[PDB]
Amino acid sequence: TLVKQLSSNFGAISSVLNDILSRLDPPEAEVQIDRLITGRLQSLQTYVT
């Protein structure tokens, strides 16, 4: 399940950090990075519990 949660958008344009960083400027790529970070952090916390 953990490995399958990496290919999730969580409300972003893509699930790959490289595509977001290549296509987009930092000040308005920060929001996509933030949504990805929140989703992955939640999944990791659930796994550990």
Partner: protein, 50 residues
């Protein structure tokens, strides 16, 4: 083959991109390619956006 002709060196009267940055357009590859442009006069209500 073609880039930078109007990407940077043009009188940008209005140039607004969604989902991408204008300066990064020279490093990307596009699929299901339209890259097409729709030529209209569009009155003057410049609210063609999502």
């Amino acid at each position: 083959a073609d880039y930078s002709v109007l990407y940077n060196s043009a009188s940008f009267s209005t140039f607004k991109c969604y989902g991408v940055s204008p300066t990064k357009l020279n490093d990307l590859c596009f699929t299901n390619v339209y890259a097409d442009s729709f030529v209209i006069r569009g009155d003057e209500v410049r609210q063609i956006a999502p």
